[PDB]
């Protein structure tokens, strides 16, 4: 009756698994890159524009025509920097399972990529146009009515995953009840266009928040002013026997046009 | 250590952006230009027409035949004027980012075109046939019933951007429930013909107002009388060293045919 | 300083507009032209026929068989004439804008055709087959039940412009709710056959009236007996200095068959 | 002045129109001709048939099996006559518009054919199975339930035009509410099958009556027994100068199978 | 004059028509023939089978494992007899129209074949699986749920002809409203699969009875046991001058698998 | 008279039929097999993972960059045992129909295989993601919303047949109505995807419970650790003249990923 | 012996004498004809004119200059009609000496010309300048003093024949003789002038009347508006065998300037 616990049993470990992000980046492909400041002196950038004079008016016979003058307006943005760093000891490197070094310079780039997207989202949230709609086709039409469009243009809608389900069921139940388009959408289960705007889901946006974009070819909603790309430097400390790795980035996130973006608030 | 504040920081300036109108012109293409008054003394035009005699009657053998007469009618309109102007100093022209002179030259024409379009709209907004409908298919049919036609024709309906959404929602909700043609219109978000009449959206019109046109080849509901075309004149003030630019236009807008335009009042 | 108030303003007149009929003729091409009396002496036309002899009957053995006789029937129609004339004075011709003479010449021919169409309508409106229906598909079926047909035929419905709109709206709202044909009809706005009968609109028929026709290949409901064509004459009066123009037409409108036509009365 | 009354006014007379029946012969295509009696002495036909002995039974060991016998049945039919006659005088034949002789010759055959059709209808109407129906699809299903069929066959339905119209209206209104077949049948106006049975309209049937048929290739619902065919014989009377034409027929109409025809009574 | 009553009318007879079964045979294709008992002594057949042992259980270290046992089951059947008899006198055979002996020979076999089918239906009607359903789709689903299946299978439904019409009407009224397939079925009047079960109509089942089957490639619910084939004997009776014909058959009807048959009761 | 009762009636037997499992195996294909522990000492298996550092931060000019460190996590699972036993006596083996030892040998392996799936089901049921739904479409949507996914992915739904039937009828009646796809689903009686999740029926699950899976190419929700295969040992007992048969198996059922499995409780 | 009384002497006719007006036409040459209305659709003539600006002033070195404006005036006149007619029989045409048709044609024009002259005379008298004078030189000078002219020559005087003789007796030696180029003989035999005013005799004016004119190169006193000239047309009356000849004229007489004519009244 020796059994177990009366004898020594070793341990077995499976190969270690690396880290991957649990959220996808969606606000990076929606911005245009600007490279004017790259390689030249100066850390600012100015956008000037002209103004309107006014409409014409009827003039009586023999009178004097009034005279007007044009105007101008300017804006600017300033570049900033973002950095990240970590430290590795000699003892941990020598007697650590797996390869600790590679994970560090992988996660540095991962953190920088997440930081850029977070900054872009925070910048895009600052629009002045607001709306309050319910997750229904009527709500979507009310939200689209804010743009006051007169010709066909494209739109993009980004909402939380939970609101998209309510929207899909609401559209399917009554608006597309008895067609092939509704039945195919139900059976497949995929999300598609509803009123001319694509539906994109992002885990970053919590319930009750959303955005609405109007996509045009040469008037970007967001601009990404870049100064210098990512570079990684590595050094060693002889006294403490440690390795230091750091990374840095030089960029700026700007909201060029506030009219093409509408803030959203969804209630019940 | 040296810093940015110590060294001289220059500036970078993006290219200038010209001005463009935010409202489209929809009523000018529907008007016919008449050049009768050009090159002739007088500023009034008259449109005469003929009338009907009657119907035949039964006559016995060897009996007299009665005699009848005809008649005529006339209408008239009068021309008017509109103008605009601006100035520019010498120092601004010599030392100024971009080209202000071309900007003024373009903006004068833009303002004149906008004024002509507004005049055409306010001229066409004065018919005698009026209707009061709700934004449904039944209201459109009731409005069309006023025309009292006997052959297929082509109609154009002009409404505000807000009314088009309501019309689309109602038509897709009650008249096109199960048909796929409703499903494609809903998914693609495209405004199409409803009862043989096209739907056109204009920002100039306000909520609760619209017009309905009956389009025929050679009988226009609107005309544009052109006594003279647009011209630009320039002069220089030697004493004070300034430049003067002006513009002018002689024309008149007339509602030729009252029967082809219906003034619509849309209420809930 | 000068000004247009002081000077003289002559008047300018656009080219004059000739008259054209505002109502189309839909009842002339539905008749068959008979040319038996053209070029021969006579003013009446006679139509004979035959009569059934009677069905056979059972006969006992060795019995006499009754002897029967055939019979005939006759009908007739007499021609008439229609006339129209006008007169224009010399002073009006010397000092009148446009050209009165040609206008009168064409208006005489227009009036004669209008009279022929009106005569055909009045001749066709006197049939003994009458019905009372509503402007809905059930009313159409009830009216068509009068014909008592045992084989497929074609039909023509002639109604006022207003009744056709109500018929189309009712048919689209009730009977064609969810078919692609109904959606296409609403989108286009055209009028099509509803139960085998085309929909034809004429302004002459006031609201509350209508006619129904059965188009047989060789059996016409209306026959247009003609004796002579249109001629125009001119003459001058020396004593009073006036011009005289006159025109006439010899013809007759007949209702050959009364079973083909139905008279309709539409009430709410 | 001379007028039409003074001059001689001749006559113009259109060609005659022959007589053609206004009712179709629907019944005689549905009968199979029998020529057994042709050329053989006798005028009665007899049909024998056998019977079924009875189902088997279970018998205990050592018992006695019961014994049964067969039977037979017979039916019969008798032939009849039909004839027609006419008289024409030489004076009328010499001076008479048209050709009376050919008209009489054709009308004799037409009368004989109509008599045969009427007897076939009267013979077919005398079936034993009866049903009372409301003119609607479920009524037709109730009718078809009488046949008690396990497999699928073909049926034919003959009703008055009003009954067919009511059937078409109800079927299009309710049972084919939202399919393309209903819209196509409404727009075209055609009459078609309802539950596998075609619809044929007969003017001879009065309102509120109808027939239902089961068509089998070998078994006929109706039989026509003919002893002789139609013949024409002519004779002349010298004393009064007249001509006599007479025709005769020998046949009989029989209902061979009573289970293939149902007498229908349609009430609101 | 001579008449037909005076002369002698001979008699004419059509060829005779034999008897055929009215109700079709549906049950005998379903059963499977068995031939174990033929040619060997014995009249009972026994079918044994095995049972499950039980599920496994978890056992800790150094513990006893419980022991279990298995079992068996038995069932049996017994055969029976069926026979038919008839007798025909010599005088009837000497002077009789047709061939009575052949008709009797055929009818004995027909009666035996019908009796076998009646026995099969009687045996099949007795099962332990029962349910009460209406003539609707929901009732059919309720009956199907008794099987408690998990894989796709094939089912066959047998009901009286009256119930099939009600089922078709209800399915086409409520479940297949707007589909083209429903319209096609209604127009063609053809029964078919409803929920994966094919509909069979039979005349041997009165209203209010029904059966539902599950079809497996090699597992039939009904088994037909045969001991000896059908044989026919003949004999002559000298004393009465009559002929005696008898037939005999030995078989039995069994329900091998109860779970493949569901008894149904249809009530409104 | 030498009846069957007087004589000796023998007994006839049919070939024996072996036992087979009646419930299908569903969960075994959904489990990955791991052989890490086989062949080496040890009863536990460890899976290590890495962690995140943190998002980047803005740094002023000429300031120190903070430093961070990474971390790890671990898990562990342990194997277990299962066994089954059987006893057979000498008398039963010596005199018994068929072979009673091979049947037990086969049933032992069947029982062990069933126990494996029971253990897999018990392991799957322990997830912490739970929801309460109704057997309808919106219940399925509520169940799916727990996953909180932003990209289209496959799913698998496992329910009892009774709940599957209710789901099918509800989806056919309410959502997939008036479409040909639903008509084919009804007529063919097939189970298909409803919102992107397949419908699979397992008879092991009772009424009111269910499971919802998310399928990914290389991340399985369930893992089956293996230590040793199945071996059979037998022995004989001299004292009781009996034989003992036992089986053993060593394995472990583990829930590797919790987020891929949701536990469903279905109530009205 | 044979004088003229015995023989026969015919009669000889001298050539006929055409008719000529007894009173000469004097007021016709004094009017200036205007042919502006011939060939144009109009019957009202407008005469515009300009006005004078103002005197010029003296301007010092370096001073400004004032500005002025002009003006216009208008008048109107309308035309009328005059006509004449004549008839002639057939016998008088065949059996008449001379040419009666030519005589009628010439007298028509003569009468029309006389009518025009009379109308001019009637229109001339409506001036607002009147004076009473004696038949002496001093009275003529007093009458001439009203004009307040610059040049002393260029007057015309028309009086009755007796007043002319009285005037000639009053001025025995101051009356310049009517020699050629002494009295220019404007019309015919306009003999000697007194005080520079020519004297012309007209029998239309009664005693105690007279007109005084002032003739300059471009400013007339009377204007003759002409729309169409004299035309003669012919027609024939069949019933009475007579011919009809008529003529017409379209003209108007206007008093352009009231200050160039003086109406006199001569007292004894």
User: ∠ CA(G63), CA(G67), CA(G73), 5° rounding?
Assistant: 160
How far is the CA of D260 from the CAs of B255, D116, D156, D219, E91, in angstroms? Answer: 77, 21, 11, 9, 38
Q: Is F106 exposed, middle or buried (0-12, 13-18, 19+ CB in 10 A)?
A: middle
d(CA A32, CA A30): 7
Q: Which sign, positive or negative, has the C-alpha torsion G188, G189, G194, G196?
A: positive
Whether the CB of D53 is below 8 Å from some CB of chain E: the reply is yes
Contact E62 A1 (CB under 8 A): yes
> Which residue matches tokens 């061939």?
E99
Residues in D touching B61 (Cβ below 8 Å):
3-4
Do D56 and E115 contact (CB within 8 A), yes or no? yes
d(CA E202, CA C192): 48
Strands D44-46 and E12-13 come out as parallel
Whether the CB of F69 is below 8 Å from some CB of chain A: the reply is yes
Chain C neighbours among B 21-50 (CB < 8 Å)?
34, 36-37, 40-50
User: Is the same domain home to G231 and G217?
Assistant: no
| E86 assigned to some structural domain | yes
| G180 assigned to some structural domain | yes
Residues in F touching B178 (Cβ below 8 Å):
178
| C26 assigned to some structural domain | no
| E172 assigned to some structural domain | yes
Phi-psi category of B94—alpha, beta or left, where left has phi over 0 and alpha has psi -120 to 50? alpha
Residues in F touching D178 (Cβ below 8 Å):
178
Q: Which long-range contacts (CB under 8 A, 24 or more apart) does G112-115 make?
A: G112/G82, G112/G84, G112/G230, G112/G247, G112/G249, G113/G25, G113/G28, G114/G21, G114/G25, G115/G82, G115/G249
The 3-state secondary structure of chain G reads CCCCCCCCCCCCCCCCCCCCCCCCCCCCCCEEEECCCCCCCCCEEECCEECCCCCCCCCCCCCCCCCCCCCEECCEEECEEEEEEEEEEHHHHHCCCCCHHHHHHHHHHHHHHHHHHHHHHHHHCCCCCEEEECCCHHHHHHHHCCCCCCCCCCEEEEECHHHHHHHHHHCCCCCCCCCCCCCCCCCCCCCCCECCEEEEECCCCCCCCEEEEECCCCCCCEEEEEEEEEEEEEEEECCCCEEEEEEEEEEEEEECCHHHEEEEEECC
C13, C16, C94, C236: best to mutate for the G interface, most G CBs within 10 A: C94
User: Is the same domain home to G244 and G261?
Assistant: no
Tokens at D117, concatenated: 């059709």
Q: How far apart are the first and last CA of chain F?
A: 70
> Which residue matches tokens 């076939």?
D120
Could you please report the per-residue DSSP string of C151-171? S---EEEEE-HHHHHHHHHHI
A56, A185, A220: best to mutate for the B interface, most B CBs within 10 A: A56
How far is the CA of D140 from the CAs of C138, D163, D199, E223, in angstroms? Answer: 22, 12, 12, 41
| B130 assigned to some structural domain | yes
Do F82 and F52 contact (CB within 8 A), yes or no? no
Tell me the residue range of the domain where G119 lies.
31-51+71-124+223-255
Count the neighbouring beta carbons within 10 Å of the beta carbon of residue A254. Answer: 20
User: Is the same domain home to G242 and G118?
Assistant: yes
CATH number (domain holding residue G196) = 3.30.2320.10
Phi-psi category of E91—alpha, beta or left, where left has phi over 0 and alpha has psi -120 to 50? alpha
d(CA F153, CA C235): 96
| D248 assigned to some structural domain | yes
E41 → chain F, closest CA residue: F10
Do C171 and C185 contact (CB within 8 A), yes or no? no
Residues in E touching D254 (Cβ below 8 Å):
none
Chain D neighbours among F 166-185 (CB < 8 Å)?
178
Cβ within 8 Å of residue A266, ≥6 positions away:
A132, A133, A134, A135, A139, A159, A163, A208, A209, A210
Chain CA centroid to CA F222, Å: 9
What single-letter DSSP state applies at residue E207? T
Q: Is G119 exposed, middle or buried (0-12, 13-18, 19+ CB in 10 A)?
A: middle
How many contacts (CB atoms, under 8 Å) link D and F? 5
User: Is the same domain home to G106 and G214?
Assistant: no
CB nearest to B84's CB, from A40, A48, A65: A65
d(CA F45, CA F59): 44
Q: Which sign, positive or negative, has the C-alpha torsion D38, D40, D45, D49?
A: negative
Contact A61 C1 (CB under 8 A): no
What single-letter DSSP state applies at residue F53? -
Do C126 and B106 contact (CB within 8 A), yes or no? no
Nearest one of B117, B125, B122, B126 to B249, comparing CA atoms: B117
> Which residue matches tokens 């779970």?
E259
Tokens at E59, concatenated: 């056992």
- Determination technique for this entry: cryo-EM
- Shortest Cα distance from D86 to chain C (angstroms)? 5
What single-letter DSSP state applies at residue D16? P
E89 → chain D, closest CA residue: D69
| C82 assigned to some structural domain | yes
Half-sphere exposure of A179 (CA within 13 A, CB side): 24
- Shortest Cα distance from B181 to chain F (angstroms)? 15
User: Is the same domain home to G212 and G163?
Assistant: yes
d(CA D219, CA B100): 102
Whether the CB of C56 is below 8 Å from some CB of chain D: the reply is yes
Alpha helices in E126-227 (DSSP H): 137-144, 161-170, 180-188
Could you please report the per-residue DSSP string of D157-194? EEE-HHHHHHHHHHIIIIITSSSHHHHHHHHH-----S
Cβ within 8 Å of residue C149, ≥6 positions away:
C214, D161, D201
Secondary structure element (H or E) that encloses residue C105, with its range: helix C100-124
Cβ within 8 Å of residue E89, ≥6 positions away:
E240, E241, E242, E243
| D200 assigned to some structural domain | yes
CB nearest to B178's CB, from D1, D3, D178: D178
G71 → chain C, closest CA residue: C6
Residues in C touching A62 (Cβ below 8 Å):
1, 3
Contact D188 C193 (CB under 8 A): yes
Contact F61 B178 (CB under 8 A): no
Residues in A touching E178 (Cβ below 8 Å):
178
Contact C86 B196 (CB under 8 A): no
Could you please report the per-residue DSSP string of C128-142? S-EEEE-SSHHHHHH
What single-letter DSSP state applies at residue E218? S
- Shortest Cα distance from E215 to chain F (angstroms)? 16
User: ∠ CA(D201), CA(D207), CA(D208), 5° rounding?
Assistant: 105
Tokens at D2, concatenated: 């001379």
Contact C62 E3 (CB under 8 A): yes
What single-letter DSSP state applies at residue B206? P
Do E203 and E209 contact (CB within 8 A), yes or no? no
Strands D209-215 and D154-159 come out as antiparallel
Subunits close to D (at least 3 CB pairs below 8 A): B, C, E, F
Do C172 and C186 contact (CB within 8 A), yes or no? yes
Q: Is F100 exposed, middle or buried (0-12, 13-18, 19+ CB in 10 A)?
A: middle
Half-sphere exposure of C150 (CA within 13 A, CB side): 14
Tokens at D107, concatenated: 């009308």
Half-sphere exposure of B202 (CA within 13 A, CB side): 20
Task: Return the SS3 of F171.
Answer: helix
Do E213 and E255 contact (CB within 8 A), yes or no? no
Could you please report the per-residue DSSP string of D122-164? HHHTT-S-EEEE-SSHHHHHHHHHHH--SS--EEEEEE-HHHH
Do C135 and C201 contact (CB within 8 A), yes or no? no
Residues in B touching C97 (Cβ below 8 Å):
48, 72
Do F169 and E174 contact (CB within 8 A), yes or no? no
Whether the CB of A61 is below 8 Å from some CB of chain C: the reply is yes
Chains G and D share 3 or more Cβ pairs within 8 Å: no
Do B178 and A178 contact (CB within 8 A), yes or no? yes
Contact E4 C62 (CB under 8 A): no
Residues in B touching C250 (Cβ below 8 Å):
none
Nearest one of C152, C116, C131, C148 to C26, comparing CA atoms: C116
Could you please report the per-residue DSSP string of E4-65? TTTS----EEPPPB----SS---STTTSEEE-SSTTSS-SEEE--EE------EE--TT---
Chains F and G share 3 or more Cβ pairs within 8 Å: no
The torsion defined by the Cα of F152, F156, F161 and F163, in degrees rounded to 10, comes to -50
How many contacts (CB atoms, under 8 Å) link A and F? 145
Tokens at A212, concatenated: 């609405």
Domains identified in chain D, total number: 1
Buried b (16+ CB within 10 A) or exposed e, B111-148: bbbbbbbbbbbebbeebeeebebebbbebbbbbbeebe
Contact B196 C183 (CB under 8 A): no
C118 → chain B, closest CA residue: B55
Task: Return the SS3 of E151.
Answer: coil
Tokens at G216, concatenated: 């300059």
Do G160 and G154 contact (CB within 8 A), yes or no? no
CATH number (domain holding residue C191) = 3.30.2400.10
Residues in A touching F48 (Cβ below 8 Å):
13-14, 16-17, 97-98
Task: Return the SS3 of C37.
Answer: coil
Q: Which sign, positive or negative, has the C-alpha torsion E129, E130, E136, E141?
A: negative
Whether the CB of D4 is below 8 Å from some CB of chain B: the reply is yes
Could you please report the per-residue DSSP string of D252-263? EEE---GGGEEE
Contact F149 A169 (CB under 8 A): no
d(CA E213, CA F180): 28
């Amino acid at each position: 009756t020796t059994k177990l616990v009366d004898l020594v049993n070793p341990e077995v470990m499976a190969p270690i698994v690396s880290f991957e992000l649990s959220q996808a980046l969606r606000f990076t492909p929606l911005a245009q890159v600007d490279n004017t400041l790259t390689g030249t002196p100066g850390d600012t950038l100015t956008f000037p524009a002209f103004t309107y004079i006014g409409d014409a008016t009827d003039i009586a016979e023999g009178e004097a025509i009034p005279l007007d003058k044009i105007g101008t307006t300017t804006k600017e943005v300033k570049v900033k920097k973002a950095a990240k760093g970590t430290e590795i000891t000699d003892e941990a490197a020598l007697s650590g399972y797996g390869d600790p070094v590679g994970e560090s310079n992988k996660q540095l780039g991962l953190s920088l990529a997440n930081k850029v997207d977070n900054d872009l989202l925070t910048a895009a949230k600052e629009t002045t146009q607001k709306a309050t709609i319910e997750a229904t086709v009527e709500g979507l039409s009310t939200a689209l009515d804010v743009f006051n469009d007169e010709d066909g243009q494209g739109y993009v809608l980004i909402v939380s995953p939970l609101d998209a389900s309510k929207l899909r069921l609401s559209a399917g139940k009554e608006w597309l009840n008895g067609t092939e388009l509704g039945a195919e959408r139900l059976i497949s289960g995929s999300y598609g266009s509803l009123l001319g705007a694509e539906v994109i889901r992002s885990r970053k946006l919590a319930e009750g928040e959303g955005l609405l974009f109007k996509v045009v070819a040469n008037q970007p909603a967001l601009k990404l002013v870049s100064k210098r790309a990512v570079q990684v430097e590595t050094d060693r400390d002889i006294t403490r026997k440690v390795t230091i790795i750091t990374a840095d980035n030089h960029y700026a996130a700007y909201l060029y046009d506030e009219t093409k973006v509408i803030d959203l608030t969804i209630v019940k």
